[PDB]
Amino acid sequence: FVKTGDTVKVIAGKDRGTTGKVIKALPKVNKVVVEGVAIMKKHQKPNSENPSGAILEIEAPIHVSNVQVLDKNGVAGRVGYKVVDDKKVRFNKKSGEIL
Amino acid sequence: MKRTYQPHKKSRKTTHGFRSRMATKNGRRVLAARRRKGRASLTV
Amino acid sequence: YDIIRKPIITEASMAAMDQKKYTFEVDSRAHKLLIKQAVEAVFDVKVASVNTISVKPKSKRVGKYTGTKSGYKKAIVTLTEDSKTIEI
Amino acid sequence: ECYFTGRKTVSSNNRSHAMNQTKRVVKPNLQKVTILENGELKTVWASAKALKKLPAGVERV
Amino acid sequence: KLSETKSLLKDLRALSVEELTTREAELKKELFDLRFQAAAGRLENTAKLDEVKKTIARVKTVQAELN
RNA sequence: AGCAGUAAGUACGCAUUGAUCCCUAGGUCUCCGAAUGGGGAAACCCAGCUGUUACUAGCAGUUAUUCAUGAGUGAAUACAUAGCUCAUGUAAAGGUAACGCAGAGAACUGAAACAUCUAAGUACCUGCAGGAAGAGAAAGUAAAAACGAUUUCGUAAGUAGCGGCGAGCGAACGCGAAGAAGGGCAAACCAAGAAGCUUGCUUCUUGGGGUUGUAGGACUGCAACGUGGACUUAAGCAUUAUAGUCGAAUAACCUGGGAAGGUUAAUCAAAGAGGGUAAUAAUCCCGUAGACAAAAUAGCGCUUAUACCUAGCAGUAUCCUGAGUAGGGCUGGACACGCGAAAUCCAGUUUGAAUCCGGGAGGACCAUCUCCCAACCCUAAAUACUCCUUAGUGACCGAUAGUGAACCAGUACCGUGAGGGAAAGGUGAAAAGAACCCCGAGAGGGGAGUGAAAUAGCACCUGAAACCGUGUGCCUACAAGAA
RNA sequence: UAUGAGUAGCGCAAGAUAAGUGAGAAUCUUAUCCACCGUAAGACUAAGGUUUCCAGGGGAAGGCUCGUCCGCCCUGGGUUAGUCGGGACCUAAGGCGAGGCCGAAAGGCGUAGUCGAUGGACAACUGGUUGAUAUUCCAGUACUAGAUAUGAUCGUGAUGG
């Protein structure tokens, strides 16, 4: 997409309908780590930067298909973009149009 | 007994140096075969 | 002009310090008189001469293919006394 | 080899009695001559056909 | 942010090589004791190496090329 | 909108202010290498000159050769000449995918052997060229009215022919289609000059003259047509590569680790091509169809005067029209053509015309007739092939295949060399890669936990097959079997 | 993947004990004896090898067995010149060869010239020095050649001889 972002729905996949804030997408990964979503956990060794380890609630990224950006009234769809203003205006379809 | 190659540095060159191979309009041709194939090196 | 590469710190480097010598590096395309006067310029240290030696390249394996580590001309900076040593 | 005589020793092929499929080498006439001086002063080969047609136009050509 | 200021400011003006680039093709052209802190360690701060060589680089390839 | 190639892997950092990135142009461009100041084995050494700036430095450039063009020099020997010196011009040497052309050019074969033939003038090798090359404007074919440069394809048709007439090789004509452009010069003459100025010169230089077949030009008449053709110049126009941009149309339930699968419904429409998405999507995304966008970018094309040389025409004073040239002898070769009745063309060698009342061709050749005008030069187009640039297409192929090479392949490796020449992809969706605990020198294991799954644990999907096993019910330690 | 087959071989010479090392010692290390070679099985030096050297650490494979050891592996250092060998000198044998010669072509020959050492030219040698470099680092003595600083004086005297 364009930079996510906001709370973002997850329609299909392991966790249906879950919304969660994003800023950290890195679209070259083409699947987005979102807090709360795809709860990975790592049994890490008691080593540097965690001298106990065994628990890392870092979470997995899931595909662009299961990312769904909502406009600010919680309404997702398809991003019509660049349409309105100086450089670019993002919106979804059937949406409240905000970014 | 004695084997074939017990070469020295003059021995390992002076048949196969870049001007030796390049010289006679001929070895440079087969070097250009070795370029148009393009193996691991050229001159040796 | 300052085309000195780097110093070299061995355990013999402290013997060079006590000897008022150094172990400095430059580029290959060089001459010990030329880097001698360059050392004289940027350093104002009083040089006797420099020794000759360079180092062959070290082609071992570094990684999953052959580490073709390159050589460099280990310049033995032979000074005279009554000048400015550099302790870096 | 001679320049203004045209060609050279050019290859050919030999015949024989109930021909045995053989080869020849065609050689023209070979004469180093220095005929004229236009600013010439130049020794060069020639062929005898061009010798007999030196008086055709060959004093400068 | 930092780099567009601290790169674009410098020497697009047409003063000359032994004239303007005295700060770069003469002064900080002493790349000594920054390199020479390189591999001496005790530096902790990297980007100056190709940053400064980049600035003297653009100094030469623009300013010590345009004449 | 993050960047910080490969990829972990780190750090200072860096960045919607506009980064990273994409494109275009300019920059610098180590050394070698055509490689070239000189030598030299490839990654070298040693220089000279000119300024530089300082040093028994450094910087920056100049210094290979041949050719051509000048300039100077000036031996035997006076001029000269050779020769030498300097200057100018990448010219140009060189690298080359395939096609071409030209030279040089076999054998093996096959012919049931083989000396003729064939293979083929092919394999190779060398040179010369471009985007194509050659190719070409009748000194043609043909045989009656018969057309009118070439080129490619089909036809004629294995037809005519040739050939130890074996074995084979092999047309052309005419027709059909594409493509369809011809135009200069020397000559003759005329004018200028200079000169054999030995005067009237009869050679050179310049510009007209005109490029010819039913002859044509020069001499007497006498007409301005765009033209790659009678200027394939420059200026605008337009549009394409060269950055890309927008770009429609959906929700729930069941299942599962996960829906796009099943079920329920709805939409769209220049987009239900295709690919991802944990499991098969039109409506999730990339996209897709369409619709926009480029300054520089390499072009293509259109209009413009210009970028310049041509016409008809009647008559015929004489000249011209392509000399060692045609031809003739001999030796070759190609032409279907193997010397033959042998055409016809091109070679060597020898001899050698005529020249417009001319000359040539019409398969030996002699007459009549038909056609043409060589012996001077250029000619697009239709054609051949791709290393290449994408746009792509597949009753291509799926890791012994498909390129030798899906993988750091021409790799490893062999060989001194020329050369040869391998093997190998897949965990899981996502490393979420097994924290911890215990055994163990360690590895490795075992629990725990991980994940949908741990026979799923790093060469990891799936896992036969030979091999080795461990357990298992029966039988065999008086037996000499294709079991 | 068998098989043969746990068989051949274990690559020409003798070690021995104690102690250490470790977890594990025959084979690692030390001590102490023995033993062998010794016109060599010593040292030094060509070509060659191309870092194998040493230091530290480790033991996936390698070591023909083991293996803490190692020319194995990781990491890090280690080679120093006016005089040593070469080049900045000359040149044989030879090669290349502008000129030129001939040749289908490519070419092959070759005058000048050019490189080409195994040759001929020429200054440094004693002592110490590491884990390792020593004629190279330095103490002492030099000498060679040049430089700029400085009373010459006509002097140098060639590719010629």
Side-chain angles (χ1 to χ4, degrees), chain A, chain B, chain C, chain D residues 1 3-61, chain E:
Chain A
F1 284 167
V2 190
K3 181 180 178 63
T4 63
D6 301 331
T7 63
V8 164
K9 297 179 182 178
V10 180
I11 296 174
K14 181 181 281 184
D15 294 329
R16 186 262 301 275
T18 62
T19 65
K21 58 166 291 301
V22 192
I23 206 63
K24 58 192 187 303
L26 205 154
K28 192 180 291 294
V29 184
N30 293 308
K31 58 185 174 70
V32 177
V33 178
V34 180
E35 298 90 2
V37 185
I39 303 98
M40 181 191 287
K41 62 186 186 296
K42 183 174 286 294
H43 285 282
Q44 182 57 254
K45 291 188 181 296
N47 53 8
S48 296
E49 294 96 14
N50 43 1
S52 67
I55 292 165
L56 291 176
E57 54 180 1
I58 309 168
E59 291 183 349
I62 306 177
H63 197 78
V64 181
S65 67
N66 274 324
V67 313
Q68 284 83 14
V69 51
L70 53 87
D71 286 334
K72 307 299 182 292
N73 290 318
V75 44
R78 297 182 66 248
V79 179
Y81 57 86
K82 287 185 180 291
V83 175
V84 183
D85 289 328
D86 182 77
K87 53 187 287 183
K88 179 178 173 66
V89 169
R90 292 186 288 176
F91 54 92
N92 279 317
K93 306 304 186 295
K94 60 97 182 178
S95 68
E97 197 269 335
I98 304 166
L99 182 64
Chain B
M1 287 183 177
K2 178 71 169 175
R3 300 282 77 77
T4 71
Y5 74 100
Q6 294 80 12
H8 42 88
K9 53 183 70 176
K10 301 288 170 188
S11 179
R12 81 191 81 186
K13 67 198 179 71
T14 64
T15 61
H16 297 150
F18 178 73
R19 279 171 284 179
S20 69
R21 295 286 90 191
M22 187 269 162
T24 177
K25 192 179 180 292
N26 189 4
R28 52 90 58 84
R29 180 189 183 186
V30 85
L31 285 178
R34 188 161 292 281
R35 289 177 63 192
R36 73 178 294 162
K37 189 173 183 294
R39 54 98 180 172
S41 72
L42 190 271
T43 187
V44 176
Chain C
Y1 187 78
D2 185 76
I3 55 174
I4 315 296
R5 179 84 278 172
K6 66 175 70 175
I8 292 95
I9 301 97
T10 64
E11 70 272 18
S13 66
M14 69 192 77
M17 291 297 288
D18 301 331
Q19 201 187 4
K20 192 61 71 71
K21 266 66 185 299
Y22 284 95
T23 58
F24 290 164
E25 187 64 39
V26 296
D27 194 0
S28 298
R29 48 179 70 93
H31 290 282
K32 55 175 69 174
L33 300 173
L34 179 60
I35 55 95
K36 181 181 72 66
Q37 70 172 353
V39 156
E40 287 288 333
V42 302
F43 287 160
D44 199 72
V45 69
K46 297 295 183 182
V47 181
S49 71
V50 182
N51 285 108
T52 306
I53 199 53
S54 178
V55 182
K56 60 180 178 290
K58 292 187 182 184
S59 64
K60 301 296 283 187
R61 65 186 186 275
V62 179
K64 62 183 74 174
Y65 296 101
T66 69
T68 60
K69 188 178 185 294
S70 303
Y72 48 87
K73 46 171 60 168
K74 187 168 72 176
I76 301 173
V77 185
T78 74
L79 300 168
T80 78
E81 290 87 4
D82 298 332
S83 60
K84 277 77 61 182
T85 180
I86 295 96
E87 298 176 354
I88 297 166
Chain D
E1 191 274 330
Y3 69 97
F4 66 101
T5 68
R7 57 178 54 79
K8 285 176 68 72
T9 63
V10 179
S11 66
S12 62
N13 284 315
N14 201 0
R15 300 293 172 268
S16 68
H17 301 285
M19 55 85 67
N20 302 117
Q21 190 59 261
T22 41
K23 184 176 283 293
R24 296 299 294 273
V25 176
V26 168
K27 298 177 289 299
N29 300 319
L30 277 75
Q31 301 184 11
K32 290 187 182 295
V33 291
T34 313
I35 295 299
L36 217 85
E37 299 287 324
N38 55 7
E40 175 177 349
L41 199 58
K42 281 178 183 179
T43 69
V44 77
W45 290 99
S47 73
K49 192 174 188 293
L51 266 290
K52 192 169 287 296
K53 294 287 104 164
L54 290 170
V58 183
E59 49 90 26
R60 291 171 67 194
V61 67
Chain E
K1 302 177 186 184
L2 184 141
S3 62
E4 65 92 17
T5 62
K6 302 301 180 290
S7 64
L8 271 71
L9 66 90
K10 290 189 176 181
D11 286 328
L12 279 82
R13 278 78 61 206
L15 278 304
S16 173
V17 49
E18 203 265 334
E19 292 78 356
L20 186 64
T21 76
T22 65
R23 61 186 185 182
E24 304 300 326
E26 280 81 3
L27 189 274
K28 191 51 70 177
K29 190 260 187 295
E30 181 265 338
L31 282 309
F32 194 75
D33 80 15
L34 47 100
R35 180 177 67 85
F36 178 78
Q37 287 298 321
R42 61 183 185 267
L43 60 94
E44 191 62 31
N45 191 356
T46 68
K48 294 175 260 72
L49 78 173
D50 194 75
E51 185 172 0
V52 166
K53 287 190 267 77
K54 177 177 69 176
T55 55
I56 306 168
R58 65 188 58 239
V59 152
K60 194 178 294 293
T61 196
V62 175
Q63 297 298 320
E65 200 273 331
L66 56 88
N67 293 318

